[PDB]
Amino acid sequence: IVGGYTCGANTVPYQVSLNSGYHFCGGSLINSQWVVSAAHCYKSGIQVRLGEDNINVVEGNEQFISASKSIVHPSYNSNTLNNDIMLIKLKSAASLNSRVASISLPTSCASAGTQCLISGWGNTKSSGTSYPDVLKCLKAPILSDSSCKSAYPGQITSNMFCAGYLEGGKDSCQGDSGGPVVCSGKLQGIVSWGSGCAQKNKPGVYTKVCNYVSWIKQTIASN
Ligand SMILES: N=C(N)c1ccc(C=O)cc1
Ligand SMILES: [Ca+2]
């Protein structure tokens, strides 16, 4: 997250870190057994880390649970990033409390102008590289579909939306991939892609979660 703020420990209780010997992506806990992340975060041997603040220090509220199964969206295209969503099942159910909690799925899509919270452990620099140890947060509005398409000609599908600031300086970035965009207590987006980070006229692009609620619910019901 570039141009954000320190969230505070366990203030984003649905935020998870996906770990394969090291943090490599974010994700969102949607019930005691399931995490939603980006399909471009797929790999084998995932351990899901819940209740994290400093990802390099055991602070007392962590739950580390190995993934038993990953399900990449059936229509994920890794070239275009269309349908950039994946579900990860935990080998054992998480213990839910104030610091480890699921986030609600949307019942309808959000609108341009809605304020959301984007979070992650990704790069905090727009030019260089600096990875934080503690969770970073950014409040950002959803941008109009027209401005999103104008920013990224030929690239924005109906399964994507832009959020952030056209002026630059505030954005998600590398390492935030797969993490949450939460608006009014609903998971509306997943950190997906963008041109660099926090660049003028290049806002963040996010997977449009509301399009996937039916798939998420039916997948969970049978897996
Ligand atoms: N919001 C961005 N600019 C952004 C999001 C994800 C990636 C993935 O590496 C890169 C850039
Ligand atoms: Ca920790």
**All domains in the chain, ordered by first residue:** 1-12+103-210 (2.40.10.10), 13-102+211-222 (2.40.10.10)
Three-class secondary structure of residue 221 per DSSP: helix
Q: Is the Cβ atom of 191 under 6 angstroms away from ligand 1?
A: yes
User: And the tokens for 46?
Assistant: 């995932």
Distance of alpha carbon 140 from alpha carbon 113, whole angstroms: 9
Method: X-ray
Q: Is the Cβ atom of 172 under 6 angstroms away from ligand 1?
A: yes
Catalytic annotation, pick one of 28, 119, 177, 192: 177
Longest dimension (CA), the chain: 47
Distance of alpha carbon 115 from alpha carbon 141, whole angstroms: 4
Distance of CA 39 from the midpoint of ligand 1 (Å)? 14
Distance of alpha carbon 29 from alpha carbon 142, whole angstroms: 22
Q: Is 111 a catalytic residue?
A: no
Q: Are 29 and 94 in contact (CB under 8 A)?
A: yes
Q: What is the stated resolution of the deposited model, in angstroms? A: 1.4
Binding residues for Ca(2+): 52, 54, 57, 62
Q: Is the Cβ atom of 164 under 6 angstroms away from ligand 1?
A: no
Q: Is 73 a catalytic residue?
A: no
Q: Is 145 a catalytic residue?
A: no
Q: Are 34 and 90 in contact (CB under 8 A)?
A: yes
